[PDB]
C-alpha cells in the first residue's frame, strides 16, 4: 500500500520556498479513492485522467500557499509562486490537488510560519527548490550582508488570519508527478 | 452608495440550468469577496458560493459543488452564478453578498434584494 | 462543520423589555461571529460582527458578546422595528454556516 496517507495527511506542511518531494517506490495505489476523498477544492490532472492510472517513481510535492496563488501550480503559469517558489513544467504529466486548510494552518493574530520567496535573480528551472537565504540585491550598491535602500531579506510570510477572505486563506497542495525510467515497474 | 442589483431569476423545469446575475455599484466591486446565499420558502438562510476578489479562489457547498459554478466580471461589476441539474431543493431566494473583510467588516456587509427561483415541473 | 444552534427557537417580550439570544457553536469559532436580522421580505441586516462589533449605522441598543463556542446577542430596550427574526453566522470554516435563527414575537 502507498504511503499517500502520510502526504496528505501530515500535521505541518512545507513551505512553498521549501517545498517537500516524497518519493514513491513498490506500493500499490488507488487514484480513483484519492479522487474520491471528496474533500479537495482543486484536483486538475493533466496528461492523464485519474481513472487511468489505476510506474518507476512517483513524486509527491507538498507545500502551502494562498488560495489565488493555487492557479500557480499550473504548466506555463506566471507569478510568484511559479517563478520564485515552485515551477512545473510545461509538459508535465501529473496532478495537481488543493485544499483549503484556513482551519488548520491559521490562527488569531496571524500564523506567520509559512514563508515564501518575494525577490530572486532568475525564474526558477521545473522542478528547482532554493532555500537560499542571501540578502537581494535591487540595487547598484552590494548589499555584502545586510538590507536597506535596495537590500532586502528574499523571504517574506504570508500572515494567515482566519477572518482573511477564500483567496488570502491558506491551501495545502499535493503535485503527484509520474516518472517512468527504463526500470522496474 | 452601495447597491446591489440581482437578475435572472424564474421558472425553469427540474434538470434545467438558470444564470442569476448581480451588479454592483458604489464601492471597489475587484477589491470585494463575494457570496451568494439562498433561503428556501419558510425557512433560514443557507450559504451556497464564495468567489474571491480576483475570481482565482472559489469554494462551494456540498449540495451544489459540481452542479454551480460561481463567477465574476471584475470590469463590468457583474457577479454570475451559473445553476445546473437544478431540483426542488435549490427553490429559494438567492441574495448576492458582500464579505467586507478588506474593509475590517469581517461580516456579510451589503445585500442584493434576492430573486426567486422555482424549480417545478 | 461548525453546526450552530440558537436559543431560544422563539421569544416573546413587550416593547421596552430586554432581549437576549444565545448562539451555540458545535466546535470553536475561530473566524468571526455575525448576528443579522430579517423581518419579511426583506434581505438581512448586518447587526454585528466579530461577536461584538456593531455595524455601522446599527443602534446602539444591539451589543454582542461571547467567544469560542458561545455568543449572545442582546437589545437592551425593545422598539417595535426589533420584532424580528435574528440569526448568528460564522466566517472562517467551510462551509459559512447559519443558525436556524430566534423569533421575536410581542408579547400579550
Known amino acids: 500500500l502507498c504511503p499517500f496517507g502520510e502526504v496528505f495527511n501530515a500535521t505541518r506542511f512545507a513551505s512553498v520556498y521549501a517545498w517537500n518531494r516524497k518519493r514513491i517506490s513498490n506500493c500499490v495505489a488507488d487514484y480513483s479513492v484519492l479522487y474520491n476523498s471528496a474533500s479537495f477544492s482543486t484536483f486538475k490532472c493533466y496528461g492523464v485522467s485519474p481513472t487511468k492510472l489505476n510506474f518507476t517513481n512517483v513524486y509527491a510535492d507538498s507545500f502551502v500557499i494562498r488560495g489565488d496563488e493555487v492557479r500557480q501550480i499550473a504548466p506555463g503559469q506566471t507569478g510568484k509562486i511559479a517563478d520564485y517558489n515552485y515551477k512545473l513544467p510545461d509538459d508535465f504529466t501529473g496532478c495537481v490537488i488543493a485544499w483549503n486548510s484556513n482551519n488548520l494552518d491559521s490562527k488569531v493574530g496571524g500564523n506567520y510560519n509559512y514563508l515564501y520567496r518575494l525577490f530572486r535573480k532568475s525564474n526558477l528551472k521545473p522542478f528547482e527548490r532554493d532555500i537560499s537565504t542571501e540578502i537581494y540585491q535591487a540595487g547598484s550598491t552590494p548589499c555584502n550582508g545586510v538590507e536597506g535602500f535596495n537590500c532586502y531579506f528574499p523571504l517574506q510570510s504570508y500572515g494567515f488570519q482566519p477572518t482573511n477572505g477564500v483567496g488570502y486563506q491558506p491551501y495545502r497542495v499535493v503535485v503527484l508527478s509520474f516518472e517512468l525510467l527504463h526500470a522496474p515497474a | 452608495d452601495v447597491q446591489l442589483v440581482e437578475s435572472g431569476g424564474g421558472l425553469v423545469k427540474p434538470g434545467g440550468s438558470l444564470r442569476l446575475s448581480c451588479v454592483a455599484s458604489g464601492f471597489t466591486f475587484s477589491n470585494s469577496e463575494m457570496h451568494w446565499v439562498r433561503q428556501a420558502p419558510g425557512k433560514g438562510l443557507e450559504w451556497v458560493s464564495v468567489?474571491?476578489?480576483?475570481?482565482?479562489?472559489?469554494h462551494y457547498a456540498d449540495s451544489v459543488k459540481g452542479r454551480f459554478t460561481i463567477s465574476r466580471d471584475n470590469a463590468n461589476n457583474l457577479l454570475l452564478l451559473q445553476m445546473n441539474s437544478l431540483r426542488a431543493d435549490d427553490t429559494a431566494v438567492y441574495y448576492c453578498?458582500?464579505?467586507?473583510?478588506?474593509?475590517?467588516?469581517?461580516?456579510?456587509?451589503?445585500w442584493g434584494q434576492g430573486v426567486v427561483v422555482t424549480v417545478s415541473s | 462543520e461548525i453546526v450552530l444552534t440558537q436559543s431560544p427557537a422563539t421569544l416573546s417580550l413587550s416593547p421596552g423589555e430586554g432581549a437576549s439570544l444565545s448562539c451555540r457553536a458545535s466546535?470553536?469559532?475561530?473566524?468571526?461571529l455575525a448576528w443579522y436580522q430579517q423581518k419579511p421580505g426583506q434581505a438581512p441586516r448586518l447587526l454585528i460582527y466579530?461577536?461584538?462589533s456593531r455595524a455601522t449605522g446599527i443602534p446602539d441598543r444591539f451589543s454582542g458578546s461571547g467567544s469560542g463556542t458561545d455568543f449572545t446577542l442582546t437589545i437592551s430596550s425593545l422598539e417595535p422595528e426589533d420584532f424580528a427574526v435574528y440569526y448568528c453566522?460564522?466566517?472562517?470554516?467551510?462551509?459559512?454556516?447559519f443558525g436556524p435563527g430566534t423569533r421575536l414575537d410581542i408579547r400579550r
Open positions: 453578498t458582500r464579505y467586507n473583510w478588506n474593509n475590517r467588516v469581517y461580516a456579510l456587509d451589503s
Open positions: 466579530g461577536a461584538s
Open positions: 468567489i474571491s476578489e480576483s475570481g482565482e479562489t472559489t
Open positions: 466546535q470553536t469559532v475561530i473566524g468571526s
Open positions: 453566522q460564522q466566517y472562517g470554516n467551510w462551509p459559512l454556516t
